[PDB]
Amino acid sequence: MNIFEMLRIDEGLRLKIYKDTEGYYTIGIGHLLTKSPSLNAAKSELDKAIGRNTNGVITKDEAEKLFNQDVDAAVRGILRNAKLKPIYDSLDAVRRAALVNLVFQIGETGAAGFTNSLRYLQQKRWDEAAVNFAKSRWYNQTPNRAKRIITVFRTGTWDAYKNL
Ligand SMILES: [Cl-]
Ligand SMILES: [Cl-]
Numbered sequence: 001m002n003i004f005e006m007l008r009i010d011e012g013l014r015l016k017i018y019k020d021t022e023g024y025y026t027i028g029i030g031h032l033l034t035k036s037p038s039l040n041a042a043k044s045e046l047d048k049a050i051g052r053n054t055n056g057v058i059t060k061d062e063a064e065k066l067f068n069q070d071v072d073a074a075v076r077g078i079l080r081n082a083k084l085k086p087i088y089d090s091l092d093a094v095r096r097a098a099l100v101n102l103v104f105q106i107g108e109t110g111a112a113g114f115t116n117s118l119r120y121l122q123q124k125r126w127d128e129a130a131v132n133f134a135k136s137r138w139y140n141q142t143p144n145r146a147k148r149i150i151t152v153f154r155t156g157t158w159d160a161y162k163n164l
């Protein structure tokens with residue numbers, strides 16, 4: 001198990017433009033195209049992203065290319081965010097992956113907004129962090145996924161992704 005396999009489990013893989021849990025145009029492995037309700041606008045972002053005139057459908061290889069970029073970007077951003085870097089540095093590799101996952105899903109801003117939960121993580125108060133994380137729109141809108149992430153933050157093990 002690793003960040004790529006983990007996010008591949010959580011985001012799935014679709015080669016045609018689809019809408020994410022929030023209703024936004026996405027493709028590949030959770031690659032958000034735009035928040036716009038315009039399909040054309042999403043298609044234009046996709047073409048820009050891939051570098052070719054696509055027609056809304058991409059190859060697996062292309063999808064993975066975007067995904068690698070996305071993961072890398074998620075990590076890069078964590079490292080440039082003063083609210084998150086210290087948390088990230090304080091964690092072991094498995095818990096860091098959970099944090100990357102969260103940021104990939106909700107964005108840096110959204111993630112850095114979990115100030116109190118992050119602080120408990122920093123203090124290594126596992127169970128308390130877990131309880132706290134659940135008190136959020138994030139958890140309520142995507143409870144299955146949030147549960148998984150939370151268990152990883154709580155235990156520092158990949159058990160929750162074992163079997164998916
Ligand atoms: Cl991009
Ligand atoms: Cl979910």
Ligand SMILES: [K+]
Pocket residue numbers: 010011012020021026029030
């Ligand atoms: K998805």
